[PDB]
């Protein structure tokens, strides 16, 4: 398909390596564009301020909704889907790639500092349809590390762009360093070689995620 | 003090790291361990499938330069155990991590099995979700990491700031009274919400769908 993904962020160097990334094909065929916007370009005042104090108290500081949303009224349309990574959003996986990969256009919101003004979300999400996700149970200090993570599982699912777990895999040389390739892989069985690597697979998907069970 | 090397066959992927003398990050491309002229570093799979994978040799001779008995090998995969907040602060006091990034179909499984003879070896996937290769997740468990390093349950809510109006949406009033205790109580109740809607296996409920 054809999707264009825009990016905002105060950080815009941060996403410049996965432009480049992307295959001449298939932006000559016009199958993608990815865009990076600095949010600089929206403030209001000559401090270029994208930050200010909490209500209500606590520590760090809060990202400025006046900025926000005149960066996603420019950049959005009533198509758009917004994505905004957040700690505290629904999970990201590889059921929501396959879902928004057949998307137009992707906008994702960029945070640092301790995050957006709710309002934001909540105002654009009464014109267009927005998305609080998190790529995993760790901290960030922002949203750019997950915005890179996002394009990449999405895109490498759209035609020409980019349980049980899988076990190990092996090539040559059949001996290294005094370990040798399992000998069935090198049998000529293949419904053993099947067989093998269901179980492999049984085995490690038991030590390392019991969850998936 | 903690020394961080990232091996990569794209060592330009990791620019963004230079996010920032506490913490030394080196990055270094794969193939200035190869011999041959078409510096090969991936061939077929053993037993039949699909694409590629990357050969120990390499893999072995760059390790050996590059770690010591002392460091932790960290190997993202689809396949590891999950990198977590804890797995981060237990990486936080490390020395020296030096984390190994697979292309292609992933990594002969023999160049974790033999570095585990001499140091200690942690393959791990940072969510359920599958990448082309170990260079975002680099940068992921690389951001985690360093932010706990010494000298640098429930989801959060939401969080305001000015003007107390906008666009005719009002910062909750509570949050505006000055009182302590119920603006305590009320961002405790919003997280609950939160977490039950977003992420109730963090409080022992099933998950959706
Ligand atoms: C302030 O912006 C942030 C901070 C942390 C964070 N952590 C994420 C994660 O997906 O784990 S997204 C995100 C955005
Ligand atoms: C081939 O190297 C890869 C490929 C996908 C992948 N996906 C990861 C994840 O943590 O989800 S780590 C990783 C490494």
């Given at each position: 398909?054809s999707?264009?993904?825009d990016?905002?962020?105060?950080?815009?160097?941060?996403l410049?390596?996965?432009?480049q990334?992307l295959?001449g094909?298939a932006?000559d065929?016009?199958?993608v564009?990815?865009?990076?916007?600095?949010?600089?370009?929206?403030?209001?005042?000559?401090?270029?301020?994208?930050?200010?104090?909490?209500?209500?108290?606590?520590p760090?500081?809060?990202?400025?909704?006046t900025?926000?949303?005149?960066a996603?009224?420019?950049?959005?349309?009533?198509?758009?889907?917004?994505?905004?990574?957040?700690?505290?959003?629904?999970?990201?996986?590889?059921?929501?790639?396959?879902?928004?990969?057949?998307e137009?256009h992707?906008?994702?919101?960029?945070?640092?500092?301790?995050?957006?003004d709710?309002?934001?979300?909540?105002?654009?999400?009464?014109?267009?349809?927005?998305?609080?996700?998190?790529?995993?149970?760790?901290?960030?200090?922002?949203?750019?590390?997950?915005?890179?993570?996002?394009?990449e599982?999405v895109?490498?699912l759209?035609?020409?762009?980019?349980?049980?777990?899988?076990?190990?895999?092996?090539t040559?040389?059949?001996?290294?360093?005094?370990?040798?390739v399992?000998p069935?892989?090198?049998?000529?069985?293949?419904?053993?070689?099947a067989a093998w690597?269901?179980?492999?697979?049984?085995?490690?998907?038991?030590?390392?995620?019991?969850?998936?069970?």
């Amino acid at each position: 398909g054809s999707m264009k993904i825009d990016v905002v962020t105060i950080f815009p160097e941060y996403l410049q390596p996965v432009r480049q990334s992307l295959p001449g094909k298939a932006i000559d065929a016009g199958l993608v564009d990815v865009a990076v916007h600095d949010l600089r370009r929206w403030t209001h005042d000559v401090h270029k301020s994208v930050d200010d104090s909490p209500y209500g108290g606590g520590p760090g500081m809060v990202m400025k909704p006046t900025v926000w949303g005149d960066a996603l009224d420019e950049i959005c349309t009533s198509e758009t889907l917004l994505v905004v990574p957040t700690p505290a959003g629904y999970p990201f996986t590889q059921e929501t790639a396959w879902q928004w990969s057949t998307e137009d256009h992707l906008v994702i919101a960029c945070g640092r500092y301790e995050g957006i003004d709710q309002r934001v979300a909540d105002d654009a999400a009464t014109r267009m349809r927005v998305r609080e996700v998190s790529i995993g149970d760790y901290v960030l200090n922002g949203g750019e590390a997950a915005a890179l993570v996002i394009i990449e599982a999405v895109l490498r699912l759209v035609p020409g762009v980019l349980s049980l777990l899988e076990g190990p895999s092996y090539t040559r040389p059949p001996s290294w360093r005094g370990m040798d390739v399992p000998p069935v892989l090198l049998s000529g069985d293949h419904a053993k070689i099947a067989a093998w690597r269901a179980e492999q697979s049984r085995q490690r998907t038991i030590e390392r995620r019991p969850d998936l069970l």
